[PDB]
Design an enzyme around this catalytic site. Sequence first.
Site, short mmCIF file in Angstrom:
data_model
loop_
_atom_site.label_atom_id
_atom_site.label_comp_id
_atom_site.label_asym_id
_atom_site.label_seq_id
_atom_site.Cartn_x
_atom_site.Cartn_y
_atom_site.Cartn_z
N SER A 49 0.78 -1.24 0.00
CA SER A 49 0.00 0.00 0.00
C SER A 49 0.81 1.29 0.00
O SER A 49 0.23 2.36 -0.13
CB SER A 49 -1.02 0.02 1.14
OG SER A 49 -2.04 -0.92 0.91
N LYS A 212 2.77 6.64 5.25
CA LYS A 212 1.86 5.70 4.61
C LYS A 212 2.41 4.29 4.76
O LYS A 212 3.58 4.01 4.41
CB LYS A 212 1.68 6.03 3.12
CG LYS A 212 0.81 5.02 2.36
CD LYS A 212 -0.66 5.22 2.69
CE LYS A 212 -1.52 4.01 2.33
NZ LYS A 212 -1.44 2.93 3.36
N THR A 213 1.59 3.40 5.29
CA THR A 213 1.99 2.02 5.52
C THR A 213 1.71 1.13 4.32
O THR A 213 0.93 1.47 3.42
CB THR A 213 1.20 1.43 6.71
OG1 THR A 213 -0.21 1.56 6.43
CG2 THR A 213 1.55 2.18 7.99
N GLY A 214 2.36 -0.03 4.31
CA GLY A 214 2.00 -1.10 3.40
C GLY A 214 2.13 -2.42 4.13
O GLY A 214 3.07 -2.59 4.91
#
Length: 267
Positions: A49, A212-214
């Site tokens: 993501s 922003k994470t993934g």
Amino acid sequence: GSHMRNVAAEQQLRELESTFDGRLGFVALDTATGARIAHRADERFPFCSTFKTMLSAAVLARSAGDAALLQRRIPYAKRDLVRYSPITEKHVGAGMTVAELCAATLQYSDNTAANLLIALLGGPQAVTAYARSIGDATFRLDRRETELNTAPGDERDTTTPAAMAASVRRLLVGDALGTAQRAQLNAWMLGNKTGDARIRAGVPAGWRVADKTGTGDYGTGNDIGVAYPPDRAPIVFVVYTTMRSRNAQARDDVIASAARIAARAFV
């Protein structure tokens, strides 16, 4: 900071990686001096993501030349929803504005929002073309949600820590976007809700964090962004991790520890 502290931090990242059965990809940049702390900086990792930052930047760039793109409302039905859409599932029917979709995809990692925005731009090739336009010829978005996330030397939907760090720096701190668009992207990412246990957990509570994470299979655990300490230059953080075992869970603790290593080295 100092060269010796940066060198020592890189050694601490090697030691951190040895504590788990996987790979750590890491770049931190102290924008006061351009000093870099890196581990596996030029190796490819599945971005999961984290690409939603590049996606939202591409939408903002398009909005600079359009009338009221951000205010366009895009209708969609419940049957258009893809897996993991905590915000978009609440607004089926009339839908949500482009700005609200950007916020949803950035702050909640909403997948339907991502796909709506990918379609708006003209597909994954358009997001990749945007990346090239800001000096990132490494990033490749090949697929849409949720396929891009099922994650292994498959180079689809990958980037390098170095490429993503340079992109994050140019987008959130530098001049890749106009002054107003930069402020908007920061505003959205500063409100992220999915990253409390990652970069945020590894830096002081008195620092603002835009991130922003993934997350994906093979215990893929990522977080990218910028920390804003109160009386110094911003620090870019890019953390990619992925494991050997497909069943493995992502490691928030490892991601936080990596960020902490760089934070302590630069402060």
